[PDB]
Symmetry: D2
Subunit: 329 residues, 4 copies
């Protein structure tokens, strides 16, 4: 599978890094508004993920990564990208600018066969989350991989709902700082809290991840909503899910049910630990949802708070590639 990346931001770069360790996917082209030498620097050095484990060199305005040449472009309009030349099958839409059908379809008019959006859709483009509803993919040519937080919540919510039935749930994610935030108090006209200094503050934030679960798991439609707190850590976030269960279930039953999925049909997607973990212990986590057995607490058999960690860059990026491979089957 030959794939091109549009947007070499946080997600595009780690999608690129993760794709190197895969045998079924080849990155052949990248498009961003930055020169290739700068793109090389951003790939070689990363304050969160360490130095690139490979070779990066610039030759004639293009990138040579581990011997393979990657066509570099800097086109602003996605109709122009000429995806035909390097022969790309799927395009990873990681700019955040093109989250509709008409936006991303310009990739298909430019020669790509299918595209995966590295963010939640803004129209009705179908969203797919591994562990949740990958098995419901119906050959659509443009898909969304939802968001970091949905990829953490949905697999956990599916296991809980399938074994015990979620009547209703309220969610809080304690989220690491992201590129949208400011170093000091600065302008953020659509989200006033979000403009305050990120390193000084716990910042409440809205989120649609809890309701978006209703789209990937229609059973839970209208039963979850939530919010977020942004805190001054560079990476790794944690979901705090408070749910009511129709079927009584002790905490040990919940642990066993999650551990079973983590070792079975959801291996590599849902993780499970009983160790004294903290957030940095998941820097690099490929699982999109690691259940923290000892951090959760139950008030009784039908009212429980469940905790699950996610590397909001590494897990999401690896599942973007899983979605790319899945829609290419």
């Amino acid at each position: 599978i030959k794939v091109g990346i549009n947007g070499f931001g946080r997600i595009g770069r780690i999608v690129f890094r993760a794709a190197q360790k895969r045998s079924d996917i080849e990155i052949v082209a990248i498009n961003d508004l930055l020169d290739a030498d700068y793109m090389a620097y951003m790939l070689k050095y990363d304050s969160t993920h360490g130095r690139f484990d490979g070779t990066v060199e610039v030759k004639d305005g293009h990138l040579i990564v581990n011997g393979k040449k990657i066509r570099v472009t800097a086109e602003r309009g996605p109709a122009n990208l000429k995806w035909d030349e390097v022969g790309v099958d799927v395009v990873a839409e990681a700019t955040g600018l093109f989250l509709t059908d008409e936006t991303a379809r310009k990739h298909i008019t430019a020669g790509a066969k299918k595209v995966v959006m590295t963010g939640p859709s803004k129209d009705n483009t179908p969203m797919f989350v591994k562990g949740a509803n990958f098995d419901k993919y119906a050959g659509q040519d443009i898909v969304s991989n939802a968001s970091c937080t949905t990829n953490c919540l949905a697999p956990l919510a599916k296991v809980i709902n399938d074994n015990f039935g979620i009547i209703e749930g309220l969610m809080t994610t304690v989220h690491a700082t992201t590129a949208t935030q400011k170093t000091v108090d600065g302008p953020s006209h659509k989200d006033w809290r979000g403009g305050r200094g990120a390193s000084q503050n716990i910042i409440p934030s809205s989120t649609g991840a809890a309701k978006a679960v209703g789209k990937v798991l229609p059973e839970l439609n209208g039963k979850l909503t939530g919010m977020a707190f942004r805190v001054p850590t560079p990476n790794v976030s944690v979901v705090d899910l408070t749910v009511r269960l129709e079927k009584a279930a002790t905490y040990e039953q919940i642990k066993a049910a999650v551990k079973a999925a983590a070792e079975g049909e959801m291996k590599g997607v849902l993780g499970y630990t009983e160790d004294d973990v903290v957030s940095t212990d998941f820097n690099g986590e490929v699982c999109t949802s690691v259940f923290d057995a000892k951090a959760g607490i139950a008030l009784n058999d039908n009212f429980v708070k469940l905790v699950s960690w996610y590397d909001n860059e590494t897990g999401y990026s690896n599942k973007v590639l899983d979605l790319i491979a899945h829609i290419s089957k």
Copy 2:
């Protein structure tokens, strides 16, 4: 009212600072294992609360704060403190070492009339929280002011339970870093997570504040439990309370009920805002519980998540003085 402080830590120092702005309470003596010149330095400069707004000088091994002399001691055993000489009525027990009756009663054998513990009791010493059960004080000579988090949760929980009836509740506090934590990964044998580097990590932590509410509000006994996440901020924390209500209540009804208490019988204890606040906006907050109207969210009329901020040093310290004045009436 003449008061002595034992333990010049974070809480003892800000209890001292807040007492300066009061007309009914006079700090006359301090006891800690540190020299008086060092105690002066820790009072003059504070990375969180800024420079002391007053004069501090050391004369003959004692402190002269705003002209008044304060007797400085360095006795390890509380029987020795000779509280008689400077004539102290109430002693603020801020070391954390003496949270029983037999521990703190050595202050009373040393000449003090009553003592207030600046932390949750470990035996059955009664706890009192302003807004919750100050009106139930029955002349006891040794009392506890509970904890920072209880002082935030209990006034909010009382308003919600009195107007709508809490069936059950699960609580998460996103807590600022405290003195118990480590700068880098270091030994913490009773709490392994708590020893991990505080500036790098979201650290899950246990808490008894949600169950302790059942002690100050016996109606809620057995209906709340919770947990905590420690995050790399220096001060100010936030409570996230997910509750089921027996009586249906829209979010606007909850806002109006909390705002009414904040402007009425709980003025100065419970606060209320609809602004786009972040945590630093409450650095120095005297209210022990500031309801964040826009950060909270309701799934339906009986299942809601409520958010309330607290300066875990300033609010708690001011209410320690309120408890000292209350038990002296």
Copy 3:
């Protein structure tokens, strides 16, 4: 003196705050690309400087601060500002966009008499630094107040050079995070280091402050150069000046010389301490240069390293107002 502010960023906002405490300067108009209600929010709440100590209300698209009305505008081109109507004498150019003569002169064509740039000039507009060369102002109608770091270095360098003669000097400033930096690794095409996550990194950075001293103190022209390290603190920076002296001088002679200037002709500009200060102890410092007596060290009588703190927002902003008042004499 009636003054208008263009650009309500970090510097414009704290220039506004500091002007409130002055009897000779009245802010009558503000111009920024933000709505007035948002500008009110950014004035009321500040993660570094706390809540505004006054009243802010929005009435008919304008700001009412402490009873006084302030004309709010949102004009992108400075020719349009119509400074005549509210009758402004001096304009504080705090956008950073207009650091030439032709740029800022559009303020004078718009009705203002003089303008002060809140940043170093890019052409040959004269720069003035209090303690350095305010006494050399020659009635020019457009001036620059240099930069935060120059306002710290120049008064210290003048005292050292006047008493002992600086042969040569190398400077390092350990600088707090600023609005130009990123929360996580992100694009910064003109300064690749500057785009790396600010909270995770010590970031080396270029600086022209050491050479710019040669402009405000022509004696030191060509004798100083330097560099910077950006570190994850929100405010307050520190200059580390390594100099060779022609005249031998013990460290105690240097302390006495700096203390003399701090208590004499440079009172309120240059500060002096021998206390165990850290950076937060200067959050709010009005002095642009506080000599740290105990942090400095001498190798011998002619080779010494001198340390001086500055609040890169508060000191600079207060001296912008001092320059405004000085050019209005």
Copy 4:
């Protein structure tokens, strides 16, 4: 070579981790005041260095790391350690408690042949720094590896002094937070600045590393002194060396001289880069001194400021093992 570690702190743990990747050194025993299961947890998870790349299991109160058994002890007095049983040749003294001859010689009375202190000596025990004076080791049975900062400064200083002659030098290290510091303002009676909150502050600090260079490089005795600034980063520090050269030398000559040593006789000790690096780019750096070519600046041919990075844990730990192997030749 069989080696035992005393003290499983930051340095002891990373000495252990680095020793795993070596063929000449085998860790056979560890001694600390912590249970073996806790020691396992501290080895498996590290907020700065990630998860251990190997297997850790506890069997009968001992550690099994990568199949090999390691004898765990918890003896407070080093005479008791019975180093004979597991047959250890060299002991790494990483507690910081035993930095004299009489202190550490109890390891030799306990069966060890030689000991290496993972810190600067407090008596006259010889210090050795790779790149500086490893070739001057004279068969002594107890040695010190100096400090993190000396291991960065000395190799750089040797190259500069050997090629150009250092007349005099002043040094500043911008140092990451260490275990000695506090999360919030707390007691530190021997260093008042050092007790202030580490995440909020730039903290000036004393250092003996610049003078200690005179011990490992007797030519530079009395020609260097310095200071430090502690900043809120978890790991990696940087040396800023301002020197006068007797022999004129352009900056490009200095770059070429350092690059030559980094590629020649000091390969693996002294590193060299011209890239736009920041501190996280050296998390895991094995070189004890990486010259930052573009961060340094020269005022003229005889007065220059040189910048060099070091991972204060990883570089130092790897050279502790190099010293252990060197004294075993």
